[PDB]
Design a protein around this motif. Structure first.
Motif, PDB file in Angstrom:
ATOM      1  N   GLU A  48      42.448 -10.846 -23.638  1.00 41.66           N
ATOM      2  CA  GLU A  48      41.381  -9.848 -23.524  1.00 41.66           C
ATOM      3  C   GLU A  48      40.402  -9.917 -24.694  1.00 41.66           C
ATOM      4  OE1 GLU A  48      42.963  -5.930 -22.626  1.00 41.66           O
ATOM      5  OE2 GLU A  48      44.182  -6.711 -20.963  1.00 41.66           O
ATOM      6  N   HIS A  49      40.924 -10.133 -25.898  1.00 43.18           N
ATOM      7  CA  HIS A  49      40.079 -10.311 -27.075  1.00 43.18           C
ATOM      8  C   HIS A  49      39.196 -11.561 -26.976  1.00 43.18           C
ATOM      9  CE1 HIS A  49      38.704  -9.892 -31.190  1.00 43.18           C
ATOM     10  NE2 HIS A  49      39.151 -11.102 -31.475  1.00 43.18           N
ATOM     11  N   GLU A  50      39.784 -12.680 -26.554  1.00 48.04           N
ATOM     12  CA  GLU A  50      39.033 -13.922 -26.387  1.00 48.04           C
ATOM     13  C   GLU A  50      37.919 -13.769 -25.339  1.00 48.04           C
ATOM     14  OE1 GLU A  50      40.614 -15.690 -29.618  1.00 48.04           O
ATOM     15  OE2 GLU A  50      39.046 -16.547 -28.366  1.00 48.04           O
ATOM     16  N   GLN A  51      38.214 -13.068 -24.245  1.00 48.47           N
ATOM     17  CA  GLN A  51      37.205 -12.730 -23.235  1.00 48.47           C
ATOM     18  C   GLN A  51      35.992 -12.010 -23.827  1.00 48.47           C
ATOM     19  OE1 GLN A  51      39.250 -12.288 -18.907  1.00 48.47           O
ATOM     20  NE2 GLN A  51      40.069 -10.860 -20.416  1.00 48.47           N
ATOM     21  N   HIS A  52      36.246 -11.045 -24.711  1.00 47.85           N
ATOM     22  CA  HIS A  52      35.189 -10.286 -25.396  1.00 47.85           C
ATOM     23  C   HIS A  52      34.347 -11.167 -26.337  1.00 47.85           C
ATOM     24  CE1 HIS A  52      34.026  -8.047 -29.143  1.00 47.85           C
ATOM     25  NE2 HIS A  52      33.323  -7.387 -28.241  1.00 47.85           N
ATOM     26  N   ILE A  53      35.016 -12.078 -27.044  1.00 50.27           N
ATOM     27  CA  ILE A  53      34.339 -13.024 -27.931  1.00 50.27           C
ATOM     28  C   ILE A  53      33.434 -13.937 -27.096  1.00 50.27           C
ATOM     29  CG2 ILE A  53      34.625 -14.978 -29.561  1.00 50.27           C
ATOM     30  CD1 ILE A  53      35.255 -12.162 -30.808  1.00 50.27           C
ATOM     31  N   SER A  54      33.978 -14.477 -26.007  1.00 49.30           N
ATOM     32  CA  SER A  54      33.180 -15.290 -25.089  1.00 49.30           C
ATOM     33  C   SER A  54      31.919 -14.563 -24.615  1.00 49.30           C
ATOM     34  CB  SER A  54      34.014 -15.734 -23.894  1.00 49.30           C
ATOM     35  OG  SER A  54      34.977 -16.677 -24.302  1.00 49.30           O
ATOM     36  N   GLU A  55      32.072 -13.309 -24.200  1.00 47.36           N
ATOM     37  CA  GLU A  55      30.941 -12.476 -23.784  1.00 47.36           C
ATOM     38  C   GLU A  55      29.882 -12.279 -24.888  1.00 47.36           C
ATOM     39  OE1 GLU A  55      32.097  -8.639 -22.155  1.00 47.36           O
ATOM     40  OE2 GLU A  55      29.994  -8.081 -21.824  1.00 47.36           O
ATOM     41  N   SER A  56      30.331 -12.076 -26.126  1.00 50.49           N
ATOM     42  CA  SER A  56      29.418 -11.882 -27.252  1.00 50.49           C
ATOM     43  C   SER A  56      28.599 -13.134 -27.562  1.00 50.49           C
ATOM     44  CB  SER A  56      30.160 -11.394 -28.502  1.00 50.49           C
ATOM     45  OG  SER A  56      31.064 -12.375 -28.991  1.00 50.49           O
ATOM     46  N   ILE A  57      29.220 -14.304 -27.442  1.00 47.13           N
ATOM     47  CA  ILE A  57      28.505 -15.577 -27.595  1.00 47.13           C
ATOM     48  C   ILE A  57      27.462 -15.758 -26.486  1.00 47.13           C
ATOM     49  CG2 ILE A  57      28.707 -18.099 -27.815  1.00 47.13           C
ATOM     50  CD1 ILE A  57      31.521 -17.675 -28.861  1.00 47.13           C
ATOM     51  N   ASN A  58      27.866 -15.506 -25.236  1.00 44.03           N
ATOM     52  CA  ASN A  58      26.951 -15.544 -24.089  1.00 44.03           C
ATOM     53  C   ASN A  58      25.689 -14.689 -24.291  1.00 44.03           C
ATOM     54  OD1 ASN A  58      28.486 -17.393 -22.642  1.00 44.03           O
ATOM     55  ND2 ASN A  58      29.576 -15.841 -21.447  1.00 44.03           N
ATOM     56  N   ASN A  59      25.882 -13.485 -24.831  1.00 46.34           N
ATOM     57  CA  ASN A  59      24.796 -12.573 -25.171  1.00 46.34           C
ATOM     58  C   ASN A  59      23.839 -13.179 -26.207  1.00 46.34           C
ATOM     59  OD1 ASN A  59      24.378  -9.682 -27.194  1.00 46.34           O
ATOM     60  ND2 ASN A  59      23.401  -9.926 -25.168  1.00 46.34           N
ATOM     61  N   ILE A  60      24.373 -13.842 -27.238  1.00 47.68           N
ATOM     62  CA  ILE A  60      23.508 -14.466 -28.255  1.00 47.68           C
ATOM     63  C   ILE A  60      22.710 -15.622 -27.657  1.00 47.68           C
ATOM     64  CG2 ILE A  60      23.299 -15.447 -30.583  1.00 47.68           C
ATOM     65  CD1 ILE A  60      26.074 -14.337 -31.214  1.00 47.68           C
ATOM     66  N   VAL A  61      23.395 -16.468 -26.889  1.00 46.91           N
ATOM     67  CA  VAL A  61      22.759 -17.609 -26.224  1.00 46.91           C
ATOM     68  C   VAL A  61      21.681 -17.124 -25.243  1.00 46.91           C
ATOM     69  CG1 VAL A  61      23.118 -19.696 -24.865  1.00 46.91           C
ATOM     70  CG2 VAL A  61      24.804 -19.060 -26.538  1.00 46.91           C
ATOM     71  N   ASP A  62      21.996 -16.077 -24.490  1.00 51.05           N
ATOM     72  CA  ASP A  62      21.011 -15.477 -23.602  1.00 51.05           C
ATOM     73  C   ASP A  62      19.790 -14.970 -24.363  1.00 51.05           C
ATOM     74  OD1 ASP A  62      20.289 -14.593 -20.843  1.00 51.05           O
ATOM     75  OD2 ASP A  62      20.283 -12.637 -21.862  1.00 51.05           O
TER      76      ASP A  62
END
Lengths: 173, 173, 173, 173, 173, 173
Positions: free
Chosen positions: F98-112
């Protein structure tokens, strides 16, 4: 005019370490004089061993100096007094030397003990090579004295003892 | 008790050589003190240079001792007086050191001259490494002094001069 | 002929001789534990404990070497017959972990005594022994933890013994 | 609980082999004691030789233990009696040691003879390395004793014998 | 559920070591902040040096964590306070950093002293790499501060100091 | 003297600084999870999570390096004390996945955000981080799947921990 950082060691440690530099200097000279006595009395084995040992004590002094320098501690070199130059013989020289090495060991034990008491573990940690090497030197002088006493002074004794010491001198190079 | 051979060198040569051993030991201690001054005043370039130089001067003393030993000449180590510990600054140190090296050079020329005069060509021949190495050291101090005087004290002169000396220290191994 | 007195103090001598005898006792105990395992189809634990027993004897020899070099007479006592009956693998390793804890404590006591008596030759010497004993104590903690985690029920013994076999082989090479 | 296979050796051979393990452990301690006597009486040559030999006898005990383990035979370690520590000299030590080696040789001959009588050719065959190595050791102690007696204890005799033994110690390791 | 072995270290030493982990994490962030200040004020030499040093302090925290883990000691990470970000210049940064390193040195001396008092020689012995490396770092920051003060901030001073520090950064990696 | 303005936009700067702090937070969380495992006989999961915690800090440093090169001040916040109490291995890995999922989402947001603001220097830079994070997320998915498949009943914990130990060691080399 620029500011340089204060000495990084305590006054007591500074005093003990500077004293120890001077002790090693004086020891080096004593061993040079013992060496010369042997060389001028047909004992070139003991002469070489003691010359090389003298050189090594000076190497100890330089290592202590490096440590003082790195800690911004002024090196305070005192007068080095003229070493004893008169000796009775091979046995007497190594008896004197062994006693001297015991004194050197005691002096290092004293510095290390003070490092513990003042919680100067930088200095405790640094002195460990010196404790280890000095113990080896002390054991070495014990063994040479044991061998000299075992061989004795009767016909060829001095020759055999000196050749034994020669072998040690060469194997340690 | 066994007979050992008389010293192989003349009385005057013995005297000058023993004095030279003591000169080099004194020199070594002087240079350790100068070194320590530089280290405690943020001049670690000159600190290192002078430390290494001090060690080399002791190497000369040992080489002279070896020659006395091989000639059956008693080594006569006298009392090494405490070196000066207080200095004005980098230029003053190197001015003092250059003058000192000039004196050491003079002292070696004097022994070589006496070897020629008394027809001691074993000793004349032995001392040639020492003449050559001392000439190199004297030139070295002249060069460092010249450079320190060229750079000066005006900012950032001390830093520049010490880095220059650091470079020499490292290059000489 | 005269031989030099022991180089260590009476209290340190006694503690070190006691330690040699402790390691010898320990070695036999582990041999006995190893045999129990080998005769109860636990050859992995058998090998591990055999190799550990041999290592404890290696420590005893290293302590003997230090006593010898210091001119200290080695006093070997009677070595008690080790316990030979055991309940199982878990009890053996609980006993062994408790045993390792006691060995660790005995070393700490010697090191503490060396500090108190200013014997830094012995302090310094014992450092390999402190480090290796800490590694051994941790190792038995880890194996006990693993045996506790696996348990005895269905193939538990087999699994635990194979795990210990892996360790035994990895510690050889 | 699981069933483990019975001991693969007979009761008599089990008894003889377990006795031999304890014999080798006892021999090891005797030799450590003899070694320490030599080390503390300036005979480091004999000291080293006897130390290394003590270690070898323990190696023999380990190899016998391995064989017992592989045959599912419980290793039965008994109390190891404290070794003799009182010795009169180099010669007495080696006279005692040679007599001891003769006893060890006899004890091995006894086990091998029992293997033959019992038709236990697995054990007969296993013990061949041990017969060979013991013979080598017994001869070795005979030769050293012969040499110590040839040299004797007069004018430098002890030193000569110890150096002789030192040479052997070093050539074997 | 299964039973795991208790912490192998005492409560006081556990507390001291856990505090030290958090101290090293805090130090790491402080150095990252100092590094960033230098990078954003054209001092990429100091920037790199301080970044690499920040990484090293974190490496120290990891090694302490490993030791806690191996002793079955819970790692207790506390909130890491945000580091100072306001700085006046190169000199102030290194004056603050040297004072900080002095604090770190003291904190390590405190743990080592407590290990001694507690007779915890496993921890004493473990901490030796850390005492040695911290001493090196403290000396390093003293030398850089000495150099920055020698150079000063007049006519090209900042550039000279930064290039000096860049040279050190590069030679250490 | 004048230094150049940050090379990145205010929004990207903030997102990237937030990301550095996220990875630091993550690193501590994994250290805490690792300690739980090590203190509950799960050294395989302990090692895995320790090595993973270190890798997350490596990502934070790489983000810091990019901020530094763009003249962007690094803003380090207070790092919250991580959760330290856990129910077991499955809960730890459910939490971590669940933590790794959140980290993945935060990176996606920066790239977006980089795409939306036309910051392709940052888009391009982040590609190593997107790839590595995807690998890490997949890894935790796989371990969780494996732990779920194995279960907790008889030797389940042991089996799962040994599986995780295999992964930990394979990812070193």
């Amino acid at each position: 005019h620029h500011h340089s950082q204060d000495p990084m060691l305590s006054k007591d440690i500074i005093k003990l370490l500077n004293e120890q530099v001077n002790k090693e200097m004086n020891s080096s000279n004593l061993y040079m004089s013992m060496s010369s006595w042997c060389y001028t009395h047909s004992l070139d084995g003991a002469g070489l061993f003691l010359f090389d040992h003298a050189a090594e004590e000076y190497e100890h002094a330089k290592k202590l100096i490096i440590f003082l320098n790195e800690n911004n501690v002024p090196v305070q070199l005192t007068s080095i007094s003229a070493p004893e130059h008169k000796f009775e013989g091979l046995t007497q020289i190594f008896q004197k030397a062994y006693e001297h090495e015991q004194h050197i060991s005691e002096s290092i034990n004293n510095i290390v003990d003070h490092a513990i008491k003042s919680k100067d573990h930088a200095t405790f940690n640094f002195l460990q090579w010196y404790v280890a090497e000095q113990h080896e030197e002390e054991v070495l002088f014990k063994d040479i004295l044991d061998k000299i006493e075992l061989i004795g002074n009767e016909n060829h004794g001095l020759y055999l003892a000196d050749q034994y010491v020669k072998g040690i001198a060469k194997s340690r190079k």
